[PDB]
Amino acid sequence: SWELQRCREENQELRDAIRQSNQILREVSERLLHFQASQREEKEFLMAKFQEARKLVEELGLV
Amino acid sequence: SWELQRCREENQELRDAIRQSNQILREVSERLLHFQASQREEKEFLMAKFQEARKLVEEL
Amino acid sequence: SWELQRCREENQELRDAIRQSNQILREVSERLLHFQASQREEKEFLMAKFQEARKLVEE
Amino acid sequence: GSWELQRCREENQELRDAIRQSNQILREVSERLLHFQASQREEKEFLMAKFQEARKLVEELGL
Ligand code: PRO
Ligand code: PRO
Ligand SMILES: [Er+3]
Ligand SMILES: [Tb+3]
Ligand SMILES: [Tb+3]
Ligand SMILES: [Tb+3]
Ligand SMILES: [Y+3]
Ligand SMILES: [Y+3]
Numbered sequence A: 001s002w003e004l005q006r007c008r009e010e011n012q013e014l015r016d017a018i019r020q021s022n023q024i025l026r027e028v029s030e031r032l033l034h035f036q037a038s039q040r041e042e043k044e045f046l047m048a049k050f051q052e053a054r055k056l057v058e059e060l061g062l063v
Numbered sequence B: 001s002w003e004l005q006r007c008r009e010e011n012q013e014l015r016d017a018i019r020q021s022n023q024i025l026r027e028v029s030e031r032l033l034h035f036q037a038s039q040r041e042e043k044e045f046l047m048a049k050f051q052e053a054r055k056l057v058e059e060l
Numbered sequence C: 001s002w003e004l005q006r007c008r009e010e011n012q013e014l015r016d017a018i019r020q021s022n023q024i025l026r027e028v029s030e031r032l033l034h035f036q037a038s039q040r041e042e043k044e045f046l047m048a049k050f051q052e053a054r055k056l057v058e059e
Numbered sequence D: 001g002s003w004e005l006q007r008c009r010e011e012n013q014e015l016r017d018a019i020r021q022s023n024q025i026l027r028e029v030s031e032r033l034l035h036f037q038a039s040q041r042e043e044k045e046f047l048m049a050k051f052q053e054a055r056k057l058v059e060e061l062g063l
Helices: A002-059 B003-059 C002-055 D003-059
Strands: none
Touching: A002 B003, A002 C002, A002 D003, B003 C002, B003 D003, C002 D003
């Protein structure tokens, strides 16, 4: 049937779009884990500095 | 004889799933854009802390 | 003595400078904890909404 | 001279050094936040790019 052939093609494209869109979302989730690993290193540089500052004032007797 | 009707029903279920997914992703996107704007504004207070520190290093 | 009084007064000013700079750093740290909380909430929302999208696709 | 004046002078030197250290800490924290900001910017640009990919997949169905 003309209409059945057309409908079958459209359904396969719809399935492909859903599958490809899920893969995009999966890649987003994985990459966000990488951004978070790098941002954990940033927090570590920052935390080291804030601890150095705290020690400075404790030691000067200013706490 | 019901092959086309089956295919049309599948098409409708798939179109509805795509629409719902699009709605979800539109919500995420729009919320993240508004969030970036709010965060930019909130970061202005950090910028202000460092301007105060600069002024201090100068007045010393 | 005169010299002791001058040194004590200078030390008060220096301590005040240190208090100010330390308080600025404490405010930065506190505000960064605000940012961390906000970002965690947005990450949780995104995760939840991606899961909802992954569910509509099941079946 | 007195023992108490020598302490005061030693305290004065340690506070001067502490001010220089505090300034260094402030500077390093500022630099790190600029780097963290650049990281977050890249994360935002990545998310925008992936959402655009998904939208274009759906637009290309033509429905
Ligand atoms: O950027 C400004 O002008 C001010 C400073 C912190 C809040 N907004
Ligand atoms: O002017 C003062 O008295 C302090 C003492 C140590 C050096 N400067
Ligand atoms: Er000592
Ligand atoms: Tb503003
Ligand atoms: Tb000593
Ligand atoms: Tb540096
Ligand atoms: Y929560
Ligand atoms: Y970039």
